[PDB]
Design a protein around this ligand. Structure first.
Ligand SMILES: [Mg+2]
Ligand SMILES: [Mg+2]
Ligand SMILES: [Mg+2]
Ligand SMILES: [Mg+2]
Ligand SMILES: [Mg+2]
Ligand SMILES: [Mg+2]
Lengths: 136, 74, 166, 93, 113
RNA sequence: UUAUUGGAGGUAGAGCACUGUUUGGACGAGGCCGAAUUCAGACAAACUCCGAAUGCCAAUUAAUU
RNA sequence: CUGGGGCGGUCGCCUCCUAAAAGGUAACGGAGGCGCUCAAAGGUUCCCUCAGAAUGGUUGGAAAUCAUUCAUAGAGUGUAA
RNA sequence: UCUGGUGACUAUAGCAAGGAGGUCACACCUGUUCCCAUGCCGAACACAGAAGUUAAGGUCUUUAGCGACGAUGGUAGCCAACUUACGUUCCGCUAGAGUAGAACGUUGCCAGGC
């Protein structure tokens, strides 16, 4: 449950979900990375449910970050009303991933261990993923 | 020193017990007792100060009081 | 007038051969002497504190104003002070008023001046400025004088106040 | 030590990618003692620039004559195919 | 550690604030002034093609004199170009533009305006 | 309509200098966990130090209908 | 007016965004205001430059005045942008 | 050529550092009787003057460390065409932003004196 503290205006548009990734597709922090390759959303509750499954296989050992902090709100109008009187209230938060940008960076681990643990949290995400390690 | 609105001040002689080393100015006025010429030949009525007789630094005051020091043979 | 010729006979050879300046017109001259006296009352007490400073240096004294009209006391453009510049025939004279001796409780004023090369002071009440009388003044007329020099070293401010007790 | 390229004939069209299917990589040269000549080096020998010094070093190429003592300036590493395109060169003089 | 401000560059920031309202039309030209500490200068410019018309200093050794606000000021104000110069237009960058440098305008209205 | 020149404006893209949102390292700011700044990264319809493709008005411009 | 109608809310002017780099451009799409005020807060001639960040200095708001230094607009413009 | 006055040139020109001098010309100061005036003070504005000083301002010669300008190649977007319901390819023109090669410690008009 990562949230923004302050948001300027609480009801915003939806992002243009086409194109490539902006940047952030080179890993900078860990030795091992997990990037995406298809074009969905992630809804601020995967990103912790891929964090608790990540931590426990490594038993809270080496360093693990995230890279995707959700900024945008998204609204669902309440239970079965007719169309059009104004937008509904927010209910979650979101951050759109393009193809080819890094989600997770991990370090302080051998190769044969962390390549398992990224796979076990790749099934908690609504996206297709692919292992990667420090473009040199 | 635009005209009009200010009170007037001018020199004096401050008759100190040590050389009376003050011929500077001020707003005080009374009867000119002892005029001079080497200083400001003006209202001499600046009476007395304690300027140059015992500074806390550039002089010598009386001694300190008492330590433990039983110099009275109890 | 004699204070100026001691500034033109005594400190000339000293400060140019202790600090070792090259030219002759390099010594720290004394610029303005500002005197600011705040008042704790934003109502009426400053009506009676106008005359106090004018007995010490007869320049009329500006009543300043606030800038911001801050939190829990005052609104904009009141009066809370009285600055007075003292520049040439006064700065050679009010600094020549070396009678802070009336205060007498260890007249040694300060050790640390300020980081930039000025030198601010303090007073408390009817002690200094020996022209005034201790009869008609049932209030602490305490002031805050200053002394700024053309020097750019606080070590130079340490030497230049050789004749005011620290 | 081991590099070669052809002076890439200029004003190429947007069919430049159907020769990137074969393992080439376009590049230009800079430098004190040169003029900007687009070259076409094949990256099959770019498993053999790690195999001399690593990244920071010198290797000559010989585009005709004047094999420049060069250095690898920058990449354009686009992922999802795990390849390199448009590396750049820089003489030392 | 106060550094005393020069009079010169403060008397130049104000200059563009004045010469933004007037310009030498080459038919109704523009005489400016100068002053430093002793000697006051005076040109006259066309601000279209950027040429001068009649330079006349004060320190030009026309005659040695004294009293810099008295007639030594006025002498160049009587120094005049016998040209197509009609009533000209004065630039007044230094203050009191009928009082201070008025020795350059007490005699500029003698014949030159 | 088309070639040529000259122009108006701030989208797609990019970027963090601007108001705002951010996860990491050292940085200070009481008597065992927190209070300004700095380095390396990101996000934006009401964030732009930048900034195209096209369209749009005008050449007393030349070719064609 | 109305994603059928009553119910709720709206009905003219002003400022953005949506609006797709001229102008224009809707929806029960997203945000805010107004139905005045000022004899000087209008006209003219001169002159001056800011909120802050430090650094110390009777009173101490953390911040009511005073100076010094680094401050390109980070302040201000009677009123919302 | 050089010093000064007034122009144009998008800071390529400016700040940041460091060394050099004289005042024939700017300054710094010497004062306030007068011209004028600081909601106060002649520091500033103005006036009267020339014994001092190059430290400062301004001038000149180096330093690319601060900002600023900045090419060739690329990649994203994209008018036109084709194919296709794929967060699409493919072909033909224009072509940035960041980032690197770097250029750069100003240029030039006209006056009066050397
Ligand atoms: Mg001056
Ligand atoms: Mg965008
Ligand atoms: Mg949009
Ligand atoms: Mg209905
Ligand atoms: Mg439009
Ligand atoms: Mg003076």
């Amino acid at each position: 449950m990562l949230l923004p503290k302050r948001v300027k205006y609480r009801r915003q548009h939806r992002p243009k979900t086409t194109g490539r990734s902006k940047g952030g597709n080179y890993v900078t922090f860990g030795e091992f990375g997990l990037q995406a390759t298809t074009t969905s959303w992630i809804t601020s509750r995967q990103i912790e449910s891929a964090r608790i499954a990540m931590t426990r296989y490594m038993k809270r050992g080496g360093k693990v970050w995230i890279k995707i902090f959700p900024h945008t709100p998204y609204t669902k109008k309440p239970l079965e009303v007719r169309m059009g009187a104004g937008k509904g209230a927010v209910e979650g938060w979101i951050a759109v991933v393009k193809p080819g940008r890094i989600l997770f960076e991990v370090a302080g681990v051998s190769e044969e261990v962390a390549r398992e643990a990224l796979r076990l949290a790749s099934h908690k995400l609504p996206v297709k993923t692919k292992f990667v390690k420090r473009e040199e | 020193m635009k005209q009009g609105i200010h009170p007037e001040y001018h020199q004096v002689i401050f008759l100190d017990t040590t050389t009376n080393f003050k011929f500077l100015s001020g707003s005080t006025k009374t009867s000119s007792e002892m005029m001079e010429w080497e200083d400001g030949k003006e209202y001499p009525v600046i009476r007395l100060d304690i300027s140059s007789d015992s500074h806390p630094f550039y002089t010598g005051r009386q001694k300190f009081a008492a330590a433990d020091g039983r110099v009275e043979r109890f | 007038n004699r204070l100026k010729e001691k500034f033109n006979t005594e400190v000339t050879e000293n400060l140019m051969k202790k600090f070792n300046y090259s030219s002759v017109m390099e010594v720290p001259k004394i610029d303005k002497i500002v005197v600011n006296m705040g008042v704790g009352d934003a109502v009426q007490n400053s009506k009676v504190l106008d005359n106090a400073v004018e007995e010490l240096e007869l320049i009329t004294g500006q009543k300043p104003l606030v800038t911001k009209a801050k939190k829990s006391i005052a609104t904009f453009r009141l009066r809370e002070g009285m600055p007075i510049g003292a520049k040439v025939t006064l700065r050679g004279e009010r600094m020549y008023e070396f009678l802070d001796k009336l205060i007498s409780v260890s007249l040694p004023r300060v050790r640390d001046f300020q980081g930039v090369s000025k030198k601010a002071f303090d007073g408390r009440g009817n002690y200094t400025l020996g022209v005034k009388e201790q009869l008609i003044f049932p209030e602490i007329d305490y002031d805050k004088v200053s002394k700024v020099r053309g020097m750019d070293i606080v070590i130079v401010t340490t030497a230049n106040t050789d004749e005011e007790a620290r | 030590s081991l590099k070669s390229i052809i002076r890439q004939g200029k004003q190429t069209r947007s069919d430049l990618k159907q020769l990137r299917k074969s393992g080439k990589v376009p590049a230009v040269v800079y430098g004190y003692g040169t003029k900007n000549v687009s070259v076409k080096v094949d990256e099959v020998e770019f498993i053999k620039v790690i195999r001399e010094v690593g990244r920071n070093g010198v290797i000559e190429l010989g585009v005709g004559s004047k094999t420049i003592k060069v250095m690898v300036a920058d990449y354009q590493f686009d992922p999802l195919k795990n390849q390199i395109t448009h590396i750049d060169f820089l003489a030392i003089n | 550690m106060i550094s005393k401000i020069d009079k010169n560059k403060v008397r130049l920031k104000r200059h563009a604030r004045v010469r933004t309202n007037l310009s030498g039309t080459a038919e109704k030209p523009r005489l400016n002034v100068y002053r430093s500490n002793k000697h006051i200068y005076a040109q006259i410019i066309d601000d279209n093609k950027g040429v001068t018309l009649a330079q006349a200093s004060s320190k030009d050794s026309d005659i040695a004199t004294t009293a810099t606000k008295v007639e030594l000021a006025t002498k160049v104000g009587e120094a005049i170009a016998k040209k197509a110069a009609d009533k000209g237009i004065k630039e007044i960058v230094f203050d009191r533009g009928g009082y201070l440098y008025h020795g350059r305008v007490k005699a500029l209205a003698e014949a030159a305006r």
